[PDB]
């Protein structure tokens, strides 16, 4: 089918109030079919002579990293001039109350392989950013596959975007590319956001989120679009001693 969902006031209101929103169908099934073909070429599962398969990308070729590609639009420029991109930009504009022309953006691709046992630990995306420069922004996480709690859908801490940027630390201080995590989220307050293919979740830069392991025999592919304002100078920057400069 070629139908796609809409957004209304209620979506925006809940995004502002809770720090995230679910969009059941941000990409049509035909757009999803094309996005899957883009991925099928971006993420090649490759065999070895008698050992384990690996994904033929940077990061995969210590402990395994989540297969990801920053700015996949460099390799597939067809990506960022899709109707799905424009639709997402318009959504970002509505949710951020900023003109589409004011938004800077980039893409990010993720693949959780079958039986991938590592979670994406609790974190806030702003924890990765320079505390000297504040941007308003959000991420639109579009899934190409069914996303369930068992396959690695996102979980959020509702209202956490109006709290502080929580203390983070590197998962491993001698292996910083593994990323950041915080221990300061009460998992009992969390809410999961399962999605059907072509669904998306949207979250503020400051909303804490987590993704479970992929316990299923199927890969779970997400395509993330990040939209943000220009940076503003912060007079009294937070220390963020976990920053990798
Ligand atoms: O897909 C995941 O496992 C995590 C996604 C995430 O952290 C994000 O989109 O900001
Ligand atoms: Ni994140």
Q: CATH number for the domain including 41?
A: 2.60.120.620
Instruction: Say how many residues make up the chain.
Output: 245
Q: How far apart are CA 168 and CA 181, in angstroms?
A: 5
Q: Which atom of ligand 1 is nearest to the CA of 112?
A: 3
Which ligand neighbours the alpha carbon of 138 most closely? Answer: 1
Q: Gaps after which residues in the chain, C–N over 2.5 Å?
A: 61
- For residue 169, the enclosing domain spans 1-245
202 beta partners: 21, 140
DSSP E strand boundaries for 164-219: 169-170, 180-181, 191-193, 200-204, 209-211
Domain tally, the chain = 1
Nearest to 106 by CA among 70, 156, 159: 70
Give first-to-last CA distance, the chain, whole Å: 46
Best mutation site among 118, 222, 225, 228 for ligand 1 pocket (most ligand atoms within 8 Å of CB):
222
Approach to solving: X-ray
Nearest to 132 by CA among 204, 241, 231, 244: 231
Q: Which atom of ligand 1 is nearest to the CA of 110?
A: 1
Q: What is the resolution of this structure in A?
A: 1.9
Q: How far apart are CA 72 and CA 224, in angstroms?
A: 10
- Looking up tokens 């993720």, which residue turns up? 110
Which ligand neighbours the alpha carbon of 141 most closely? Answer: 1
């Amino acid at each position: 089918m070629e139908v796609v969902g809409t957004i209304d006031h209620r979506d925006r209101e809940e995004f502002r109030s809770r720090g995230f929103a679910i969009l059941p169908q941000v990409a049509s099934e035909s757009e999803v079919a094309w996005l899957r073909q883009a991925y099928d070429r971006l993420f090649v599962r490759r065999a070895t002579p008698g050992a384990e398969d690996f994904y033929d990308i940077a990061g995969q070729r210590g402990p395994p990293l989540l297969p990801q590609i920053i700015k996949p639009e460099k390799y597939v420029p067809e990506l960022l001039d899709s109707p799905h991109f424009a639709r997402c930009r318009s959504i970002a504009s509505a949710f951020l109350d900023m003109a589409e022309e004011e938004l800077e953006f980039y893409g990010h691709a993720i693949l959780k392989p079958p039986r991938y046992g590592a979670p994406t630990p609790w974190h806030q995306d702003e924890a990765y950013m320079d505390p000297r420069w504040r941007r308003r922004g959000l991420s639109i996480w579009t899934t190409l596959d069914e996303a369930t709690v068992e396959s690695g859908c996102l979980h959020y801490l509702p209202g956490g975007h109006r709290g502080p940027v929580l203390p983070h630390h590197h998962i491993d201080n001698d292996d910083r590319i593994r990323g950041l995590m915080t221990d300061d989220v009460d998992p009992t307050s969390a809410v999961a956001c399962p999605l059907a293919p072509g669904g998306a979740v949207v979250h503020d830069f400051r909303t804490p989120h987590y993704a479970g392991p992929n316990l299923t025999d199927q890969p779970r592919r997400a395509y993330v679009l990040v939209f943000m304002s220009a940076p503003a100078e912060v007079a009294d920057p937070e220390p963020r001693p976990w920053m990798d400069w």
